[PDB]
Each structure stands twice: as C-alpha cells, then as structure tokens.
Design a protein around this ligand. Structure first.
Ligand SMILES: *[C@@H]1O[C@H](CO[C@@H]2O[C@@H](C)[C@@H](O)[C@@H](O)[C@@H]2O)[C@@H](O[C@@H]2O[C@H](CO)[C@@H](O[C@@H]3O[C@H](CO[C@H]4O[C@H](CO)[C@@H](O)[C@H](O)[C@@H]4O)[C@@H](O)[C@H](O[C@H]4O[C@H](CO)[C@@H](O)[C@H](O)[C@@H]4O)[C@@H]3O)[C@H](O)[C@H]2NC(C)=O)[C@H](O)[C@H]1NC(C)=O
Ligand code: NA
Ligand code: NA
Ligand code: NA
Ligand code: NA
Ligand code: NA
Ligand code: NA
Lengths: 9, 247, 30, 237, 297, 247, 297, 50, 30, 30, 9
C-alpha cells in the first residue's frame, strides 16, 4: 500500500 | 510464596497511566542523536510568540482582508474606530492565534496578555490614537470620555512603527474557567476599544485610507491546566484512502 | 519507579525536564 | 539600520534595514566528525560556491497573492554551485537570504518575508496529491493559490512561529535572514528533497495617489559552508 | 539564554515615570522580534509572589497519552464461500498516526519528533444478528498479533505456515485477559521522524509527493487462533498508541480546515464560517459590534 | 498479607519474554564441559568471512558454471565486461553468501563491504582491468569514461593472484532499510561495473578464454538490527515422516 | 586474539599515498585467509566516531526465542467404537526440532550446541461441527502432561494406572489458566548436542544413517483428565521451545533447497529458479543487464 | 517473576478503605492556599458551644 | 533479575558475553 | 503506606492532625 | 443544565 512504498497502485 | 490480594482497579486500562512495559525488539540499538535547531520543551514557550488577530471578522471581508483594519480621515471629533472581545476560550478574533489554539487544549488559565499594533500607512501620514482596556461589570463603553477612565495608552504615529497595550491579570480567583457561558463571573475578561485621539491627516499624493495589523501574545506570568480534547478539529467519517492501511 | 526489563526503552515516561529558552522563537535577532 | 554583507567576490549594502534574523538563534557550520556518516573526503569549494546569486525580479501588482521559492531547487542550475550539485550524490549547506523592495514616501504596503522548514504543499478541492511539476519550479519559483491558509490548510496568522521579518514601506526597504542546515539526516540528495521554502506575502496591498511606477521585488541568496560527497559523472534535473 | 523554570514569574511594585529619551511601550515589529514591554513599565503594579506551576504544559505530558489509532471489525466463521476482498478470520494493518484526527493534529504541531511507542490492543465480540440465530453466550478466543517490518511478506490465510514466527515477534492473548501491551523502540534510519516531508523518496520522477517510508513504523498481522465454530460471530479489534521519552523540534501553525485524506495535506473547508476557506472565524455585523455584550436592567 | 493489583498484560504469553521458570528435574547434574574448537559468540564474526558471489545468474549457466565469469581477447578498446547490483536484502548475486544469508534475518543494516576477485587463467596470460563503484542517483554507467569518475581500482594481473575493491559506507541516514522497493532513497546502494583497462593477451598454447571468481564480505564497521523470520525458507505441508513423532 | 566488542569500529582520516614495495589492495586468496585491505588504504577517508551497537546479533539473542515445535488435534468423546490408529483422549509426542522449518534452519547454522530448553504448552477447544450438534459453550478441562525418557514405557489408554506418575515429573493445568511452563536441563551424555552426525549409532551394519538417539531430549505424554461428556469436542495442543544459556561451535553453509523429511538431509529443489537444484539465484538476461536500473525522465 | 497467592477479601470494595489511587489529571497544579477565618479540625470543638 | 528456584538451570537468559575472535575463521594461517 | 504515583494528590487519607482551638467558637470576646 | 450554567432553560 502507499504508506509502505509511496507508489499509487 | 508471597501472600497477596487484589485491589479495586485491578486489570483496568486507564489512558493516562504511567508504567514500564515489555520491549518487542530485545538488544535493539536506536540511531545516534545529532543536534537539530529549534527544540521545544514546554508549550508555554510557543504561547509567548506574537501572532495576528482576525479583528475584521465581517461578512464582506474575504481571506487576507480579515487580518487588517482600515482607517480614514473623519469630520467629527472623539470617534470610535473598533472594539475586540477578550474571552480566549471562545470563537472570535483571538481564537486562531498561537495563544488561542494552545489554550483550547486546556480548561483553566491565568496571567497577563499583550496586544501590539503596527501602522501600515505612508511615511507622510500622521495621527494619534487611544487604546483602552475596561475591566468587567457592565456594557462595553461607546464614548471616549467613558473609555479613558480604564487602563489605556495614547499612541503617536512616527519613526517607531508599533505600540504595545498590556492587559494586566485582574481577577478575583487565581484562575479563570472555560464554561460554555460568556457572561459568567468565572469567565468574562472585559473589553478592548480604540478611539481617535486627534485625526488621520495625509497630503493629496498619499492614499486617503491606511491600515493597522493587530498582534497578541501571553507574558511569562501565564499558566494553563486541566487538559481536554480540542474543539477546533473533528470527523464524522473515515478520511479518504483510510482503507488502504488494511491492504 | 519499577522496571525489571533489560532494555532501557521499556521504562516509564520522563516528566522532569524543566529547562526552557523562549528567546530562540521570541528574540532571534542580533 | 545600515548594513554591509561580503561573501566571496560579492558585496551588498543597504541604508534602510531592520537588524537581521538568525533562524532559531543558530549560525551555519561544517559537519563535525562526531555527526558524520559518509567516509570519503568531502569537496569544500569555499569562495567558488559561497557568494550571492541574484534571481529574476517579480512585479508587485494591486491583485498579487504572493510568491515562493524552494531550496536547494532554485539554485541547482546556477554557476559553480549548480556544477558541484550535478557531479555529486550528496550535498549540505546553510544560506543567507536578502530581499529588496523600495518605493516613495507617498507609497504604502507591507510584505511578510518568512522561511518555512519542510513546506509540504496541499492541493485544493481534490483527493489526489500534488504532481512533480506542481512542486519543482526551479529558478522561476511559484505563486500562492490561497495565502490565507499557506496552501497547506493551516494559517497565515500563525506563520510568525517560523523565522521571519517584515518590509513595511514607511519603515524599511530590505529584509535579511540567516539559515542553518535543517534536516533529520546529516546530508541529502539535492535533486529530490528541499529543506527550506522562502515565502513573500503582501498582507497590506501596495497603494498611492502619486505618479504610477513599476515596483519590483528582488531576491539574492548566498550558500554558506557548502560540502559535497560521492563524486561521479554529471546528472541534471 | 537557557534556564530552569518550575512556576510562573513574580511581579514587582512600581512608581510614576516621566523620563526623556525612554519609551518602553514603543516597539519595532519589522525586526521579527516579539514586544519586550513589561507590566511594570505600562501601569503602576503591586508586589505579587506567584506560586502557579507549569508542569501540565511540559511536552512529555502534552503528547504522552494513549490515543485510538485503529478500529477493525471482521466476521469469525467458516469462510469457504466468501469473496476475494473479505477479511477471512485475520487482517493486516500498517501502523500510522494519520487516520484519527485528534492525535494527527497534535503531532502536526511539530516538524520533527523522536519517541518510543507503547502499543495497547483491546478486543470485543458479539453474536451475529441474522434471523437464523438466537443468543448463545460468547467464546473466550485466543488471538495472535505478529510484528512485520515495513514492506516485508505477510500471511495469506488463517492457517498459513507463516504464523510459525521463527524470528518475528508475536504476542498471544485471550479475550478474558486485561488488554495486551508491548513497547516498540524509536526505529527510524534518521535521528528523528519527519512529521512533514517536502520531497519525492525515489530516484525516478514518477511516484507520490510527501510520504517517506522511513517514517512508517511497521505492520501488525492479526488472527483468531481457534478453528471456526458452527455459528458466526463479529469480532472488533482496537489499537491504542502512547508516545514516550519524547524530543520535539520546530513548532508549526495548527491545522484550521478539515482533513480530506490520510495520504496528503489537501484542503476544501466548511461551506460557511467558521473554518471555511475564505473565513476561519465566525462573523459579526461590524468591527464596532460587541458579540456577548452585558445588558444591565 | 500484601495488598496487590493486576496490570494490563497480566497472564499474556510473549515469545520474546525473559523470566526464570520451574525446573523439571530437581538435583540434576549436567555433563562436564570440555574444550571444542571453533566457538562462535556474535553472528558478526561469521559475516566477516569471504564467500563466492553468483555473478553468472543466466538461463544457460548450469550448477557450478553460475559461480565464474569467463573473459576473452577483444578487438575494440575500452569495452564493458559485466555489472553487479548491490542491494544486500534482495535476490541477486549477493543473496546466497555468508553476509547475504545472515543479513536476511534482520531489517536494517550499516557499514562497509569488500569485494575480492581471483584470476584463474594460465601463468603465461596477461591483462589489466578497472573495477568501479558508482554512488546512487541515476542509471548504471555503460562507458569507461563515465564509470571512472566514481570510486575505483586499476588491477594488473601478476604474481599476486587477487585484488580487493572496497565499497565504503556512503549514506545520508545511519542505517539503510529493507523495504520491498529497490528504488527507495532509504534502500538503493548504487552499482559495481568492470571494464577492460588494456586487453587479455595470451600465447597460442594457452587457453584463449580465462575465468574470474568473485568473493564478498563485510568489514568490522558493519552492524544489523530488527530481527525477522527469514524469507529464504518455508513450508506448505508437514514434512515426510512427521507423523512418526506421534508413534 | 580475543577482545571485548560493544560497538562497530571507528574510521581514521587518511592522505595521498605513492610508495614503492607497498600494495595493500593486492591479496593471495589461495592461502584461505580473508582480505585484510582497510578503507583508509583504498580511498581518502574522514574521521568518524561510530556509536552503533552490536548486541542484537549476540548468539543468545539470535537463538533464544520461543518457536512452535508441535501442533496436535484430537477428538474428546466416548471412543468405544474408534479405530486402532486414533488418539483416544490422549497422545504421545517425541520432542524434536526437525518438523517446523524456521527453527530447524536456524539450529542447522551450527555443528554442535549446548543449551537448556524452556517449554510452553498452549491449549484451545471447539464444539464438533457435525449436523447433530448445536453450539453449547466450552468446557474448562484439566490436562496432564507427563515427561518420559527416550525409549521408556508410555501409557496405553486414558485411564491407565501408568498415569500415577510415582517418579516421572507430571504437570497438571486448566484451559482457563495462562499457558503451562517448565525448564528441561541440558540432558546429553556428551558435553554438547550434535546437530549433524556422520555415522551409524549401532554395532551391527543394518540401521539408519545420521540419527544419534543421545540428541533426542525425551517424550511428552498428554491426556485430558476429565471423563467424556455426552457431546464431542475437538482439542488442539501447541508446544513451544525456547533455548537458553547457549554455547555454539563450528558454523556451517545455510540450507538452500526445501526440506523433504524429518529423518535426513535429502533434497530435490524447486521446479524453476530461485532455489532449484541447478540454479539457486533467479535469472537475468545477461551479465551486462542491471535488473532494477533507475530511469530518469 | 515473584511467586504470589491471593487472600480472602481480594477484589472486594469496602466503603471505609484507605489506599492511594490513580490521578486523573497528571501534572495538575491546584490553587494556592490562603488564610480563611474559623478553621475546624475535630467535631468535639463544635459540641462545646452552648 | 528474580530467581527463587534451587537449581541454577532454572534462571533467565544470559545476554552479556561481548567477547569475540573473528581470526579463527578469517585468518587461520601461520 | 504505599504510593508509587507521581502526583501527591493520589495519596491515601491524612488522619494525624490532633491540633485544636475551641476558644475561636467558645470565647470570641476581649 | 442549571448546575453547569446557573440559568433556567
Ligand atoms: C491514486 O490514483 C487514483 C486513480 O487515478 C486515476 O487512475 C490512474 C490509473 C490514472 O489513469 C490516473 O491519471 C487517474 O486519475 C486517484 O483516484 C482518482 O482521483 C480523481 C481526482 O480526485 C477522481 O476524480 C473525481 O471523480 C468524480 C466522479 O467519481 C465517480 O466516477 C468514478 C469513475 O470516473 C468512480 O470511480 C467513482 O466511484 C464515482 O462513481 C468527479 O465528480 C470529480 O470531479 C469532477 O466533477 C466536479 C463537479 O462535481 C468538477 O468540479 C471537477 O472539475 C470534475 O470535473 C473528480 O473527477 C477519480 O474518481 C479517482 N479514481 C478512482 C478510481 O478512485 C487517487 O486520487 C490517487 N491517490 C492519491 C493519494 O493521489
Ligand atoms: Na465560559
Ligand atoms: Na504550514
Ligand atoms: Na514564581
Ligand atoms: Na527495500
Ligand atoms: Na566504535
Ligand atoms: Na554442508
């Protein structure tokens, strides 16, 4: 998810 | 073994408790400290910094216009310019300030306040104003000869741009108290009023209308107690993307 | 204050630093 | 009231200052051996990088909302500072900022000049985060959409908690601020994170009844105690 | 200049003043300093010895309170026919302080923070209320909560071999116990957490603004340990966080407009004042109108 | 008796706890200690030993062939020979090494690494190579005049068979962090590349193709923290003969 | 040379070198020693004072964690008509570390080990889900666990006179208690356990390779103490082991291919890489291909 | 840990008990004392008045 | 550290031996 | 007397002030 | 209510 990776889907 | 017995309160979870508890990661070494600018250790350090009052809280003032008061030349003597309510717990010109925002996490307060005003006209503009604080007991004064009987300063515009009015702590009790009642003898602070002492006088090439910015802060005699959830924030739903924390 | 755990980060809260310096926010000028 | 600043081959004088601000009471310095992480010997250019650079001036209009620049982004393509940034993986410095604006004894107006640490912007009326081109403006900088809430849902009225000065046209014609290194890490990659944002906001609008003239605002910035680590081939933005 | 302060400051007695070249009520706001005018310089004062304490506004007291950070409800049952999106007797949560607004606004008063985190887990159960079911009493279930680092592999089903927990920390607890409790250390790769981050945490141009994964503490993976019963129940798990051993830097303007999203600082405001985009304070009729004016009769 | 009360956490079982517990066999005498070679007391002792990198991880290389790189004479100057990804948490040439295997039981790491290369051609073979480390920020270099701007060593083949390249710790933060994201500013280490500095030159009776073996280890500035279950092992079923423990 | 090490090593500042007869970057791998080249000899360095701790990689911390070693489920009921192979309200287990792979791989990093073993026993229950049964609530049963030495006689039925436990240690515990706990001492006939054994532990040629019964700790014999109820239940027992007071010798290459059996080191590998017999690391297209290469635009 | 056992009376609430108990408001500073006329310390002082 | 049992093997874990010698694995040569 | 709380107002009752002065109620005359 | 405000409805 975005909190772990800072990528959107 | 040791003979023992359990007290009332055994097994409860109190959110303001203070105990040691089991470490998740044994032998863990946290990252070394390094110096960082701007450390804060008591919230009373923040409360002593000046911030802008929203004095022009009126239906026709939009955005940044709410943060300044405009003054112009008058043809009658002794006239009233504006007034400010002083109750630091309630909504009003003082609420969205460093002292207002921090005070609304607490329920009781004590100590002196200062208001500072800056003149933002041209260099060629001149004038004198009188700033008054009236202790509580009845209605806000509407005339200069009533208001000048209270605590006041007379301000001359000049090379120094700005003036301070002290609002001294004058209270029967050690603290004032946040009820939801503005007219309580435990809550009401009195009033601030501003009048012309002379007139705003400018030459033909200056702007005929000039502005004041007003600021507020606490002195180092100030104190706060009895912490509570702030009334300045709240929610009725989960925020956008809140389900993503479970994915 | 009671702490029998081996790691110091397990301890109770630290409520005893009364040091202040308001002047880093109120007077940051020469 | 009167001030001279001298760094490298550059000097500035002013006859109408109002003291100057040192952010949080601290002054720039090089990274000491007890705080260091990277083991290579650093590059320290001294007078090649530690000097005033002047940006394009902007016009103060009756309807202006205010202006902003991000650091180090606004300097990453200028002079020998830009060349050292493009050839190294890591950077560190302080800054000295000088903001200039003059008008006649018949003009009125007031500017807030403020340095904001970690100014993470918000977008208006959407759930989607700001894009790369909303944030990375380079030397040109940007303008405020909603200065009354600082473009982040907070407030202009409380912005005086940050390092700041005012330009009040009846009082003074310049503002000066000194900034230390301000980060959670001892050094950083300069092309992807900005430590500081300079903001200039017209809280009292420009006014007069005399002859109309164009009234610019001008920004000069000097890096202080520059250091660079991890030398290699050049990468630009 | 640093000093030790345990009470509010005393007041000294003062006399009449009339003195050329001296004007303590005048100030220069343009410098950026706050006014240094004292009460003794503005009015005649008495002597006052002030005994009011300042400890309830210490930063450790202001932030060190257990606040709600997660609430999750799921069905405990035979999941053989459930859809792909359902929590099938277990769930994953990424630890964050972004989702419940009272803790979020308090942490956002600061730019950088360093703390250890005390975690408390509270569980409750109820019988499923569909028309096939009577009430029957409530089971004393065992639960497992496993700590997993940010971005690492998590279990895919209730009976996965991943729950063997060979190096990961796990806590096992019953509904009849007091709430479960443990402390997570300050785990950042930096000397402090960044509360706000003005950058893009990747070498390419493409990803999200303003999120640094170095500030994400980790994951909790939670299951019921018991097999399903013949009848269904609903289980709710609540997580509380208390910060402790705190240091804080660079205070900030408070949030005024409502929060929109966990991911960013985006804004819209209320439809009308207070807390609207064009008006933060509620209106009065004019700058001469006193809103709570006392009437005497 | 003693008055007592129970705290939150009473009766829980935490797998990382540390308490005394009841002995099953009272008065038992364990067997005397004797000296045994090779005692280990910290896992950082194992991590400092060199082990072979799997640089040739390609579809056509089978078994032991994956552990060596073959080089031959070239007719163009300055040519690239091979490159190595450096992310010690991920799958790749570094994963199945003493440093790789032990590091994957943890989540954070810090400190310097060394790579050592051994030449395995004939005595009559000669040549020079350049080995480069590039700090992160953009794409891996494809040309010698780009790669030589980074950290490097120039290696001459001779009576000493082997050379060491140090990969120094160069990081903004005290530790790097195992996300599942190779392009993170908290995880990426940069690149290693190898080029011809001259050429491989051999006589007609030597083999025209010669091999390198590459090794890696940590230095004694290295550290690991935040322990986790290893991703290198797992099961979906009970093993063969597991029921026999219940017979 | 032995020494006390509590933190990672410091770095010293270094200058230009140009010196005949001196080549610290050249080494002789054929000797079997690891390269002694230091960073100060390879590049110009600064001074760094390193405060990073090394305690989380101590052998006692690495191995001393409670891990799952047995899970057994059985039916609590009237067993009058059950088959000969069924667990009839009791079971036998031989203590071993061979059956769950996370603990097995960690112990197999070493050739010899000496430790005491802390044993924790966790029990859960559910109503049998056949269509004759409604839910009814769950019984608070008493259980007995009896320690029996390797190869000694064990009980044959739930009500056997062998459960009188006249010299064997027994622990009695209820489902409503915290989990049962006790410590077994280091019991080997030798000065350490053998993790691997290259031999045949009998004077004839005929038996199994690689198992030495001197390394088998013992048996747990477990029963429900209560008589059967009128309705059936399923009971599950989980056993956890934590090693403590540890000494370890002669470190080994880690297991790469999946385990096949509890009895031996036999191997097969995955069908395709990673962890296949002919390829341990996952493939890339060529030795010149960089697999996670950063793209700038 | 410490070996313990519970006595008869464990968990009861007796209205005449005398123990410490958890503070609701940590770091709170009560208002300073001042002198007030007519303090009473034993009820036998009141009983002696006609 | 709390231990009221009579046998020393009952005690809590031993996390305090910081002694090392890497050279028995890194430099086993004359 | 047992008190492990940090705030003094948490303590048990105070049953030990035996001081009296009846004369402020029985003899308030010159 | 009257105990918080001393006003009657
Ligand atoms: C992460 O990415 C999310 C997905 O982004 C889209 O998909 C990717 C793959 C790319 O193609 C990318 O370029 C796309 O943008 C992103 O979520 C998206 O965010 C936008 C902007 O807020 C949403 O747009 C708004 O949609 C509503 C209508 O919603 C209905 O229809 C959509 C399908 O079109 C359904 O999915 C919804 O469930 C609803 O049924 C519009 O009303 C709204 O405004 C318009 O209307 C008003 C007047 O009412 C006008 O004033 C405006 O000018 C507009 O004309 C927006 O258009 C979009 O719906 C949403 N998509 C999805 C699938 O969620 C997310 O924001 C990113 N996250 C972060 C943290 O950045
Ligand atoms: Na009130
Ligand atoms: Na802000
Ligand atoms: Na005082
Ligand atoms: Na990663
Ligand atoms: Na050290
Ligand atoms: Na082997």
């Amino acid at each position: 998810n975005l909190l772990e990776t800072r990528l959107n889907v | 073994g040791v003979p023992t017995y359990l007290l009332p309160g055994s097994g409860q979870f109190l959110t303001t408790d203070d105990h040691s508890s089991a470490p998740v990661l044994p032998c863990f070494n946290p990252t070394p400290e390094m110096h960082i600018p701007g450390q804060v250790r008591n919230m009373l350090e923040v409360v002593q910094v000046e911030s802008m009052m929203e004095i022009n809280n009126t239906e026709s003032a939009v955005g940044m216009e709410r943060l300044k008061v405009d003054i112009s030349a008058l043809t009658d003597v002794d006239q009233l310019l504006f007034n400010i309510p002083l109750d630091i717990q309630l909504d009003g010109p003082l609420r969205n300030t460093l002292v207002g925002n921090i005070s609304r996490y607490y329920t009781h307060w004590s100590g002196s306040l200062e208001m500072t005003f800056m003149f933002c006209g041209s260099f060629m503009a001149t004038g004198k104003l009188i700033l008054c604080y009236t202790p509580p007991g009845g209605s806000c004064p509407t005339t200069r000869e009533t208001a000048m009987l209270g605590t006041h300063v007379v301000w001359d515009f000049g090379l120094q741009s700005s003036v301070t009015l002290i609002i001294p702590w004058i209270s029967g009790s050690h603290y004032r108290m946040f009820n939801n009642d503005a007219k309580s003898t435990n809550a009401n602070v009195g009033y601030v009023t501003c009048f012309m002492q002379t007139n705003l006088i400018v030459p033909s090439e200056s702007s005929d209308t000039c502005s004041l910015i007003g600021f507020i802060a606490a002195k180092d005699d100030f104190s706060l107690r009895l912490m509570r959830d702030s009334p300045d924030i709240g929610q009725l739903d989960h925020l956008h993307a809140a389900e993503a924390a479970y994915q | 204050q009671i702490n029998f755990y081996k790691d110091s980060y397990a301890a109770s809260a630290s409520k005893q630093d009364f040091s202040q310096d308001p002047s880093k926010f109120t007077e940051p000028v020469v | 009231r009167v001030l001279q600043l001298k760094l490298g081959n550059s000097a500035i004088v002013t006859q109408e200052a109002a003291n100057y601000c040192c952010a949080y009471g601290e002054w720039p310095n090089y990274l000491p051996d007890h705080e260091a992480v990277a083991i290579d010997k650093p590059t320290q250019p001294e007078t090649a990088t530690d000097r005033f650079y002047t940006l394009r001036s902007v016009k103060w209009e009756a309807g202006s909302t205010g202006w902003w620049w991000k650091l180090p982004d606004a300097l990453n393509n200028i002079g020998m500072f830009g060349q050292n940034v493009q050839h190294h993986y890591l950077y560190r410095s302080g800054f000295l900022i000088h903001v200039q604006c003059n008008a006649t004894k018949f003009h009125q107006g007031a500017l807030l000049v403020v340095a904001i640490p970690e100014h993470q912007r918000g977008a208006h009326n959407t759930n989607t985060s700001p894009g790369f081109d909303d944030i990375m403006k380079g030397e040109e900088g940007g303008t405020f959409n909603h200065p009354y809430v600082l473009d982040d849902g907070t407030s202009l009225a409380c912005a005086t908690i940050f390092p700041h000065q005012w330009i009040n046209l009846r009082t003074n014609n310049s503002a000066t601020i000194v900034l230390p290194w301000m980060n959670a890490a001892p050094m950083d990659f300069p092309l992807r994170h900005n430590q500081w944002t300079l903001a200039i906001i017209p809280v009292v609008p420009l006014g007069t009844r005399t002859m109309s003239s164009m009234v610019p605002i001008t920004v000069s910035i000097a890096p202080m105690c520059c250091e660079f680590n991890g030398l290699r081939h050049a990468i630009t933005q | 200049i640093e000093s030790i302060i345990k009470t509010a400051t005393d007041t000294v007695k003062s006399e009449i003043n009339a003195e050329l070249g001296v004007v303590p009520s005048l100030n220069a706001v343009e410098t950026g300093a706050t006014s240094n005018t004292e009460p003794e310089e503005a009015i005649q004062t008495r002597t006052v010895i002030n005994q009011h304490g300042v400890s309830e506004t210490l930063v450790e007291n202001f932030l060190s309170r257990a606040a709600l950070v997660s609430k999750r409800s799921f069905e405990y049952k035979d999941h053989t026919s459930s859809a792909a999106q359902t929590d099938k007797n277990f769930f994953k949560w990424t630890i964050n302080t972004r989702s419940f607004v009272q803790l979020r606004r308090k942490l956002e008063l600061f730019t950088y923070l360093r703390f250890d985190a005390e975690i408390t887990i509270l569980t409750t159960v109820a019988v499923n209320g569909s028309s096939n079911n009577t009430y029957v009493g409530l089971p004393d279930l065992t639960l497992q909560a496993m700590f997993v680092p940010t971005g690492a592999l998590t279990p895919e089903k209730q009976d996965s071999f991943h729950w063997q927990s060979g190096s990961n920390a796990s806590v096992f607890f019953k509904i009849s116990d007091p709430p479960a409790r443990m402390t997570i250390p300050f785990m950042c790769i930096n000397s402090a957490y960044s509360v706000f981050y003005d950058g893009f945490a990747g070498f390419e141009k493409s990803g999200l603004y303003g999120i640094n994964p170095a500030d994400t503490i980790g994951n909790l993976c939670v299951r019921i340990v018991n097999e399903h019963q013949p009848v269904g129940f609903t289980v709710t798990v609540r997580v509380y966080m208390k910060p402790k051993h705190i240091k804080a830097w660079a205070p900030r303007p408070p949030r005024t407009l409502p929060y929109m999203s966990i991911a960013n600082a985006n804004y819209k405001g209320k439809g009308r004042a207070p807390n609207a985009l064009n008006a933060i304070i509620g209106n009065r009729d004019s700058v001469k109108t006193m809103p709570h004016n006392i009437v005497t009769t």
